[PDB]
Design an enzyme around this catalytic site. Structure first.
Site, mmCIF file in Angstrom:
data_model
loop_
_atom_site.group_PDB
_atom_site.id
_atom_site.type_symbol
_atom_site.label_atom_id
_atom_site.label_comp_id
_atom_site.label_asym_id
_atom_site.label_seq_id
_atom_site.Cartn_x
_atom_site.Cartn_y
_atom_site.Cartn_z
ATOM 1 N N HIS A 64 -11.846 12.439 -0.645
ATOM 2 C CA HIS A 64 -10.398 12.837 -0.416
ATOM 3 C C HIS A 64 -9.594 13.288 -0.913
ATOM 4 O O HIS A 64 -7.758 13.800 -1.034
ATOM 5 C CB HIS A 64 -10.125 12.351 0.929
ATOM 6 C CG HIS A 64 -8.715 10.977 0.296
ATOM 7 N ND1 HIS A 64 -10.059 9.679 0.253
ATOM 8 C CD2 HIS A 64 -8.137 10.623 0.507
ATOM 9 C CE1 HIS A 64 -9.675 8.618 0.301
ATOM 10 N NE2 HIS A 64 -8.304 9.269 0.436
ATOM 11 N N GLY A 88 2.465 8.021 -5.347
ATOM 12 C CA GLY A 88 2.550 7.078 -5.306
ATOM 13 C C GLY A 88 3.558 6.765 -3.746
ATOM 14 O O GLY A 88 4.154 7.784 -2.747
ATOM 15 N N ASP A 90 1.720 6.769 -1.072
ATOM 16 C CA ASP A 90 1.115 7.474 0.163
ATOM 17 C C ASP A 90 0.109 6.381 1.164
ATOM 18 O O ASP A 90 -0.531 5.527 0.110
ATOM 19 C CB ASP A 90 0.168 8.418 -0.862
ATOM 20 C CG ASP A 90 1.493 9.454 -0.952
ATOM 21 O OD1 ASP A 90 0.593 11.063 -1.146
ATOM 22 O OD2 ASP A 90 2.761 9.630 -0.688
ATOM 23 N N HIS A 92 -3.716 6.219 3.197
ATOM 24 C CA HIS A 92 -4.696 7.247 3.758
ATOM 25 C C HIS A 92 -5.268 6.174 4.782
ATOM 26 O O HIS A 92 -5.696 4.989 4.427
ATOM 27 C CB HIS A 92 -4.999 7.095 2.266
ATOM 28 C CG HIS A 92 -4.275 8.178 1.243
ATOM 29 N ND1 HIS A 92 -5.252 8.604 0.226
ATOM 30 C CD2 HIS A 92 -3.706 9.275 1.927
ATOM 31 C CE1 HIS A 92 -4.282 9.480 -0.546
ATOM 32 N NE2 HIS A 92 -3.374 10.023 0.303
ATOM 33 N N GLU A 97 -13.421 5.924 10.440
ATOM 34 C CA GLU A 97 -13.199 5.123 11.698
ATOM 35 C C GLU A 97 -12.399 5.815 12.721
ATOM 36 O O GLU A 97 -12.604 6.427 12.625
ATOM 37 C CB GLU A 97 -12.025 4.183 11.463
ATOM 38 C CG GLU A 97 -11.625 3.157 10.122
ATOM 39 C CD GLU A 97 -13.440 2.541 9.353
ATOM 40 O OE1 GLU A 97 -14.155 1.968 10.138
ATOM 41 O OE2 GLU A 97 -13.159 2.722 8.241
ATOM 42 N N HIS A 114 -0.303 -3.652 7.119
ATOM 43 C CA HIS A 114 -1.258 -3.392 5.939
ATOM 44 C C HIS A 114 -0.696 -2.876 5.022
ATOM 45 O O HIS A 114 -0.189 -2.721 3.901
ATOM 46 C CB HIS A 114 -2.454 -4.047 6.529
ATOM 47 C CG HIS A 114 -3.160 -4.700 5.301
ATOM 48 N ND1 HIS A 114 -3.250 -5.678 4.887
ATOM 49 C CD2 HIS A 114 -3.645 -3.224 4.398
ATOM 50 C CE1 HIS A 114 -4.082 -6.057 3.709
ATOM 51 N NE2 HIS A 114 -4.440 -4.396 3.313
ATOM 52 N N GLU A 115 -0.698 -1.027 5.107
ATOM 53 C CA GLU A 115 -0.879 -0.206 3.716
ATOM 54 C C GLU A 115 0.827 -0.015 3.780
ATOM 55 O O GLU A 115 0.731 0.409 2.208
ATOM 56 C CB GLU A 115 -1.297 1.118 4.760
ATOM 57 C CG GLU A 115 -3.084 0.495 4.613
ATOM 58 C CD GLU A 115 -3.577 0.017 4.456
ATOM 59 O OE1 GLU A 115 -5.137 -0.146 3.411
ATOM 60 O OE2 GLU A 115 -3.084 0.703 2.783
ATOM 61 N N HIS A 118 1.060 -2.095 1.537
ATOM 62 C CA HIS A 118 1.476 -1.726 0.201
ATOM 63 C C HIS A 118 2.013 -0.722 -1.099
ATOM 64 O O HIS A 118 2.287 -0.497 -1.777
ATOM 65 C CB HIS A 118 -0.472 -0.756 0.205
ATOM 66 C CG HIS A 118 -1.582 -2.421 0.299
ATOM 67 N ND1 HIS A 118 -1.300 -3.711 -0.241
ATOM 68 C CD2 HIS A 118 -2.256 -2.825 0.644
ATOM 69 C CE1 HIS A 118 -2.225 -4.156 -0.926
ATOM 70 N NE2 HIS A 118 -2.824 -3.717 0.333
ATOM 71 N N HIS A 124 -1.977 -8.327 -2.456
ATOM 72 C CA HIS A 124 -2.623 -9.708 -0.612
ATOM 73 C C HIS A 124 -2.446 -10.952 -1.068
ATOM 74 O O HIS A 124 -1.317 -11.353 -1.525
ATOM 75 C CB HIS A 124 -4.236 -9.502 -0.935
ATOM 76 C CG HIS A 124 -4.760 -8.447 -0.397
ATOM 77 N ND1 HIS A 124 -5.554 -7.924 -1.070
ATOM 78 C CD2 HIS A 124 -4.520 -7.278 0.378
ATOM 79 C CE1 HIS A 124 -6.152 -6.402 0.021
ATOM 80 N NE2 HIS A 124 -5.332 -6.633 -0.132
HETATM 81 C C1 R4B Z 1 -14.544 -3.928 8.542
HETATM 82 C C2 R4B Z 1 -12.805 -4.617 8.083
HETATM 83 N N1 R4B Z 1 -12.354 -4.331 6.807
HETATM 84 C C3 R4B Z 1 -11.923 -4.449 6.151
HETATM 85 O O1 R4B Z 1 -10.993 -6.078 6.827
HETATM 86 C C4 R4B Z 1 -11.278 -3.838 4.976
HETATM 87 C C5 R4B Z 1 -12.782 -4.377 3.638
HETATM 88 N N2 R4B Z 1 -10.200 -3.543 4.407
HETATM 89 C C6 R4B Z 1 -9.284 -3.232 4.085
HETATM 90 O O2 R4B Z 1 -10.126 -2.000 4.985
HETATM 91 C C7 R4B Z 1 -8.342 -2.554 3.934
HETATM 92 C C8 R4B Z 1 -7.185 -2.520 4.382
HETATM 93 C C9 R4B Z 1 -7.093 -2.932 5.661
HETATM 94 C C10 R4B Z 1 -6.639 -4.512 6.014
HETATM 95 C C11 R4B Z 1 -5.173 -4.528 7.248
HETATM 96 C C12 R4B Z 1 -5.104 -5.349 7.792
HETATM 97 C C13 R4B Z 1 -4.997 -6.482 7.346
HETATM 98 C C14 R4B Z 1 -5.193 -8.219 7.820
HETATM 99 C C15 R4B Z 1 -4.342 -8.046 9.110
HETATM 100 C C16 R4B Z 1 -3.660 -9.483 9.680
HETATM 101 C C17 R4B Z 1 -4.986 -10.713 9.500
HETATM 102 C C18 R4B Z 1 -4.335 -11.542 9.726
HETATM 103 C C19 R4B Z 1 -2.582 -12.138 10.464
HETATM 104 C C20 R4B Z 1 -2.535 -10.840 10.927
HETATM 105 CL CL1 R4B Z 1 -0.939 -10.481 12.247
HETATM 106 C C21 R4B Z 1 -3.026 -9.724 10.311
HETATM 107 C C22 R4B Z 1 -4.723 -6.963 9.823
HETATM 108 C C23 R4B Z 1 -4.961 -5.382 9.567
HETATM 109 N N3 R4B Z 1 -5.827 -3.227 7.639
HETATM 110 O O3 R4B Z 1 -6.244 -2.750 6.680
HETATM 111 C C24 R4B Z 1 -8.286 -2.180 2.525
HETATM 112 P P1 R4B Z 1 -7.274 -1.968 1.002
HETATM 113 O O4 R4B Z 1 -5.962 -1.293 1.546
HETATM 114 O O5 R4B Z 1 -6.730 -3.474 1.022
HETATM 115 C C25 R4B Z 1 -7.378 -2.283 -0.553
HETATM 116 C C26 R4B Z 1 -8.891 -0.518 -0.875
HETATM 117 C C27 R4B Z 1 -8.761 -0.011 -1.492
HETATM 118 C C28 R4B Z 1 -8.678 -1.127 -2.487
HETATM 119 BR BR1 R4B Z 1 -9.221 -0.535 -4.490
HETATM 120 C C29 R4B Z 1 -7.551 -2.296 -2.860
HETATM 121 C C30 R4B Z 1 -7.283 -2.531 -1.791
HETATM 122 C C31 R4B Z 1 -13.369 -6.657 8.073
HETATM 123 N N4 R4B Z 1 -14.801 -6.537 7.130
HETATM 124 O O6 R4B Z 1 -13.049 -6.551 8.782
HETATM 125 CA CA CA Z 2 -11.773 8.602 13.801
HETATM 126 CA CA CA Z 3 -15.075 3.052 5.836
HETATM 127 CA CA CA Z 4 4.119 9.860 -2.260
HETATM 128 ZN ZN ZN Z 5 -7.493 8.195 -0.738
HETATM 129 ZN ZN ZN Z 6 -4.757 -4.453 1.062
#
Ligand code: R4B
Ligand code: CA
Ligand code: CA
Ligand code: CA
Ligand code: ZN
Ligand code: ZN
Length: 159
Positions: A64, A88, A90, A92, A97, A114-115, A118, A124
């Site tokens: 994308h 910077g 943004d 996505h 999903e 979470h996003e 970032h 993390h």
């Molecule tokens: C299906 C699900 N998928 C995931 O979790 C996947 C692996 N993670 C990802 O998709 C991450 C994106 C992501 C993580 C979360 C998240 C994490 C923790 C919690 C939470 C946990 C405990 C307690 C509480 Cl209160 C909340 C809630 C949401 N929400 O989105 C991708 P990213 O943005 O880190 C990323 C992408 C690309 C690069 Br290069 C670097 C970083 C799974 N495996 O559990």
């Molecule tokens: Ca969808």
């Molecule tokens: Ca996916």
């Molecule tokens: Ca921006």
């Molecule tokens: Zn993207």
């Molecule tokens: Zn993350």
């Protein structure tokens, strides 16, 4: 210290809306996600309907335009760029999903919290209670709270 926003007043705009959810529910989930972070920092977030925003929220699938292609349903749910100009900041979200307001599919609010972490410059955490832990889990949306580690992390960046 990685990049941080150089102001406490930060704008965002929603570029487009997932058909998975009602439009007002997407607005609400994103608004509350920003509010989670604004509640523990001096940061203030302003939604923009039209024009230039610091943080653009996009729903897209596969490749994308940013050299980080999404991967179909499952796996990576979303990703975001750290503070900076242009792309910077943004955030996505993978349209492959199924985005929801609840425990089914993937909860948009929790993923956005979470996003946005970032987008503000957080990395993390190894704390399984932290929203910045690397893997999504559904947690009761009403009882949801940032962990002490999430708070330490974001307060180390902005104060
Ligand atoms: C299906 C699900 N998928 C995931 O979790 C996947 C692996 N993670 C990802 O998709 C991450 C994106 C992501 C993580 C979360 C998240 C994490 C923790 C919690 C939470 C946990 C405990 C307690 C509480 Cl209160 C909340 C809630 C949401 N929400 O989105 C991708 P990213 O943005 O880190 C990323 C992408 C690309 C690069 Br290069 C670097 C970083 C799974 N495996 O559990
Ligand atoms: Ca969808
Ligand atoms: Ca996916
Ligand atoms: Ca921006
Ligand atoms: Zn993207
Ligand atoms: Zn993350």
């Amino acid at each position: 210290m990685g990049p941080v926003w150089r102001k406490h007043y930060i704008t965002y705009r929603i570029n487009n809306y997932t058909p998975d959810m009602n439009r007002e529910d997407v607005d609400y989930a994103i608004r509350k996600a920003f509010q989670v972070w604004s509640n523990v920092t001096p940061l203030k977030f302003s939604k923009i309907n039209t024009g230039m925003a610091d943080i653009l929220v996009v729903f897209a699938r596969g490749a994308h335009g940013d050299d980080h292609a999404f991967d179909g349903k499952g796996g990576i749910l979303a990703h975001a760029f750290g503070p900076g100009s242009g792309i910077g900041g943004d955030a996505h979200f993978d349209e492959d999903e199924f985005w929801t307001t609840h425990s089914g599919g993937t909860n948009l609010f929790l993923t956005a919290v979470h996003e946005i972490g970032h987008s503000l410059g957080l990395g993390h955490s190894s704390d399984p209670k932290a929203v910045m832990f690397p893997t999504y889990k559904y947690v009761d949306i009403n009882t949801f709270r940032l962990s002490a580690d999430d708070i330490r992390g974001i307060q180390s960046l902005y104060g």
